[PDB]
Write a protein that binds this ligand. Structure first.
Ligand SMILES: O=C(O)c1ccc2c(c1)nc(Nc1cccc(Cl)c1)c1ccncc12
Ligand SMILES: [Y+3]
Ligand SMILES: [Y+3]
Length: 357
């Protein structure tokens, strides 16, 4: 609204703070550069003039309540990107308004970190896989406690600080609160991480679609490549049958009950130990088998995933990041996270850090 020039170009905007009271404040940012394009809009990078901290501004068009804003405003979690401020500007289309979302700036993503190891034909050390997965499940347990389904869980949406090993879930644009009765669109997630019940056209799906997507990211981090690389919507199901086998009539009823059960070419389930490279940690395979499951209700909950034996290293008091630093926050659990499965609190929070209530 007010482009000044002190350093070279300072934009000063009355941006409402996201988390907290609707006390509109004046916020100055500089170093404005484009860091992403698309149909959603544009994402800029910037540096706040007051604090000097780095931020990312996501600019989208709005008309007449925006779901992404209402969700970003309600969420506050260490493993979720924070909506620092939001404000309404103009731009690429005159006569139209633009919602700007000022968010935490994170330098890297799980996708880019994994692509580095994949290009070198090397596998990501499991301590990274444990850390990134555990944090993703905490962010999933938090948002699911409010009934919010992310519906776009992919490695490109797992912001990452490679020095602190902190993971931030981002891109809540496709997210939605799921209520028991109301139907929801079935063509939603990113294909590589789409749940089978979504391919089967289920409109009564639950948050289990996110846990499936996470299992696809666990397998992708253990394999070096996507486990279900579907050419299209029909291939995607074919890719799942190559590993999980043909779904059982019961399973097809759990995925989409409205779906007319048919006699499918019964393919056998390829054993899980053979899908992964030799000497892949057995607990990593055991968890993936409990997340990539046809029956949505049989998939683990995000808190149950966190309590799996695969993550026991993260609960070792002597655990440290390989760069020397100590691990990021892993047991700063809030009652809301632990709301479902309360007794896991004494399992998730190890003895060496029971001060977390
Ligand atoms: O959508 C959010 O919630 C959201 C929230 C934060 C970031 C973001 C998207 N996208 C980023 N980068 C990015 C990289 C490539 C393409 C595009 Cl479109 C965006 C990014 C970078 C650094 N810090 C925070 C973010
Ligand atoms: Y999206
Ligand atoms: Y194919």
């Amino acid at each position: 609204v007010s482009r000044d020039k002190d350093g070279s170009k300072v934009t000063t905007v009355v941006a409402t703070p996201g988390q907290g009271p609707d006390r509109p404040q004046e916020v100055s940012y500089t170093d404005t550069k484009v860091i992403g394009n698309g149909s959603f809009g544009v994402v800029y990078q910037a540096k706040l003039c007051d604090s000097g901290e780095l931020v990312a501004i996501k600019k989208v068009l709005q008309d007449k309540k925006n779901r992404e804003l209402q969700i970003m405003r309600k969420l506050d979690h260490c493993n979720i990107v924070r909506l620092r401020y939001f404000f309404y500007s103009s731009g690429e289309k005159k006569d139209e308004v633009y919602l700007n979302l000022v968010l935490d700036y994170v330098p890297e993503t799980v996708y880019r970190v994994a692509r580095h190891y994949s290009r070198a034909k090397q596998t990501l050390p499991v301590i990274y896989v444990k850390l990134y997965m555990y944090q993703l499940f905490r962010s999933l347990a938090y948002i699911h406690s409010f009934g919010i389904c992310h519906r776009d869980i992919k490695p490109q949406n797992l912001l990452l600080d490679p020095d602190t090993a902190v993971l931030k879930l981002c891109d809540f644009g496709s997210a939605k609160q799921l209520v028991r009765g109301e139907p929801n669109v079935s063509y939603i997630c990113s294909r590589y991480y789409r749940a089978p019940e979504l391919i089967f056209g289920a409109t009564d799906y639950t948050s289990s679609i996110d846990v499936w997507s996470a299992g696809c990211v666990l397998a992708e981090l253990l394999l070096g490549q996507p486990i279900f690389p579907g050419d299209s919507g029909v291939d995607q199901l074919v890719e799942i049958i190559k590993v999980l086998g043909t779904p059982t009539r019961e399973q097809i009823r759990e995925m989409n009950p409205n779906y007319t059960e048919f006699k499918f070419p019964q393919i056998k389930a390829h054993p899980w130990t053979k899908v992964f490279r030799p000497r892949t940690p057995p607990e990593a395979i055991a968890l993936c088998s409990r997340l990539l499951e046809y029956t949505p209700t049989a998939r683990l909950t995000p808190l149950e995933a966190c309590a799996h034996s695969f993550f026991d290293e993260l609960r070792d008091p002597n655990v440290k990041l390989p760069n020397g630093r100590d691990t990021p926050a892993l047991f700063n659990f809030t009652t809301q996270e632990l709301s479902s499965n309360p007794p896991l609190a004494t399992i998730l929070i190890p003895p060496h850090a029971r001060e977390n209530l």
